[PDB]
Amino acid sequence: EAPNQALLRILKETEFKKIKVLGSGAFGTVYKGLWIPEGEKVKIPVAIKELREATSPKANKEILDEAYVMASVDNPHVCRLLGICLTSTVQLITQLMPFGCLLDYVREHKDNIGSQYLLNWCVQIAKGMNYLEDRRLVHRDLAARNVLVKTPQHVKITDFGLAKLLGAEEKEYHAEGGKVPIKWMALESILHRIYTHQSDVWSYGVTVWELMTFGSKPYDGIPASEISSILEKGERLPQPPICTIDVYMIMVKCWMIDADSRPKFRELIIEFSKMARDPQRYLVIQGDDEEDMDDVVDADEYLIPQ
Ligand SMILES: CCN1CCN(Cc2ccc(-c3cc4c(N[C@H](C)c5ccccc5)ncnc4[nH]3)cc2)CC1
């Protein structure tokens, strides 16, 4: 189809100063850090991710696939790649989402997260995903853990290690084995390994459930082998306490067997927008940096021709 004219930026290692670990994942460490472009005279907070440590040609392939996808997106609700650095090991460098991921965030702040935020974030994720849909791009790993907090009023979708572009105007993506987050997967993704924009919807349904239960674990207790069945019998996640039937009703729809019966991300945006206009009618909740930051700027503010 259309030619992908994204500009992958190569970055010198002298161009940015690492400052601390944020996630020494088994798969690879992720750092906080600063980037000071060529001679631009601006510093930009960034997250830096290198494939664990050792360079195994096998691993290198995937980190770059992420770099590829992440460099091909440009929307206020999706995390974009700033560029890569080809030192001994490959690094992905992107804008810093200071507050970490949304999951941890709700857990850490239950007693202060109001309805306005919950629905507002539900809107922002619906937007990000709708963007990816437009870019014919299936995420395959939508979850609360993979949404990052820029500010409490601004979340963006990240982690494209499993995304997939759709070519030859094909609809359902057939994939391999490996490690897949079952609890967030659509039924088709579990039985036929079929993935699609509409299976992303399902994962969205579970993501919205996460945020509404303040960070609970889906099907907690249960074990993934067990899952496919259950879901098969007809069982779905329960209605979260703070949830009106209206909201839970939208969650259930992202979980219907007939994948074309679920809502499109563009409808989910509309529906949540309405609700966000009167957040108290839809959610019932009890009670509703160490530098010459003189030249510090934020990615979303640093742009280059395009
Ligand atoms: C009380 C909560 N506690 C302390 C605050 N945070 C720490 C934290 C802060 C930022 C981040 C963070 C991760 C991250 C991030 N991770 C993704 C996987 C990424 C992908 C490619 C390149 C860089 C990052 N990307 C961009 N910005 C990010 N910021 C992670 C953890 C959560 C744990």
175 is known to lie in a ligand binding site? no
- Burial class from Cβ neighbours inside 10 Å (0-12, 13-18, 19+) for residue 259 reads middle
Is the torsion defined by CA of 91, 94, 100, 101 positive or negative? negative
Q: Which of 244, 212, 220 is nearest to 102 (CA)?
A: 212
Q: Which atom of ligand 1 is nearest to the CA of 48?
A: 23
23 is known to lie in a ligand binding site? yes
Catalytically annotated residue among 141, 258, 278, 298: 141
Q: Which atom of ligand 1 is nearest to the CA of 47?
A: 23
| DSSP symbols for 148-195 | EEEETTEEEE---TT-EE--TT--SEE---S---GGG--HHHHHT-EE
Q: Which atom of ligand 1 is nearest to the CA of 98?
A: 10
95 is known to lie in a ligand binding site? yes
For the stretch 30-37, contacts whose Cβ atoms lie closer than 8 Å and that sit 24 or more positions apart, written own/partner, are: 32/96, 33/96, 34/291, 35/11, 35/82, 35/93, 37/302
Query: 102 with 144: CB under 8 angstroms?
Result: yes
**PDB resolution in Å:** 3.1
* Solving technique: X-ray
Pocket residues: Cβ below 6 A from ligand 1: 22-23, 30, 47, 49, 79, 92, 94, 96-97, 100, 104, 108, 148, 158-159
CA distance 212 to 195: 25
**Strands 90-95 and 147-151: what pairing?**
unpaired
Please indicate whether the domains covering 1-96 and 97-290 agree at the CATH topology level: no
Q: What's the 61 CA to ligand 1 centre distance in angstroms?
A: 22
Query: 238 with 230: CB under 8 angstroms?
Result: no
29 is known to lie in a ligand binding site? yes
Kindly list the domain boundaries of the chain, sorted by start residue: 1-96, 97-290
**Strands 16-25 and 28-35: what pairing?**
antiparallel
Q: Which atom of ligand 1 is nearest to the CA of 93?
A: 22
Task: Name which residue sits closest to atom 20 of ligand 1, judged by CA.
Answer: 159
Q: Which of 97, 108, 149 to mutate to test the pocket of ligand 1 (most atoms within 8 A of CB)?
A: 97
104 in active site: no
| DSSP symbols for the chain | -------PPB--GGGEEEEEEEEEETTEEEEEEEE--TT---BEEEEEEE-SSS--HHHHHHHHHHHHHHHS---TTBPPEEEEEESSSEEEEEE--TT-BHHHHHHHHGGG--HHHHHHHHHHHHHHHHHHHHTTEE-S---GGGEEEEETTEEEE---TT-EE--TT--SEE---S---GGG--HHHHHT-EE-HHHHHHHHHHHHHHHHTTS--TTTT--HHHHHHHHHHT--PPPPTTB-HHHHHHHHHTT-SSTTTSPPHHHHHHHHHHHHHSHHHHB--TT---S-TTSB--GGG-----
Q: What's the 80 CA to ligand 1 centre distance in angstroms?
A: 14
Fold held by 97-290 = Transferase(Phosphotransferase); domain 1 (1.10.510)
Phi, psi at residue 290, to the nearest 5°?
A: -170, 40
Fold held by 1-96 = Phosphorylase Kinase; domain 1 (3.30.200)
Give the up-direction half-sphere exposure of residue 109: CA atoms within 13 A in the CB hemisphere. 16
Q: For 214-236, give one letter per residue: b (16+ CB within 10 A) or e.
A: bbbebbeeeeeeebeeebeeeeb
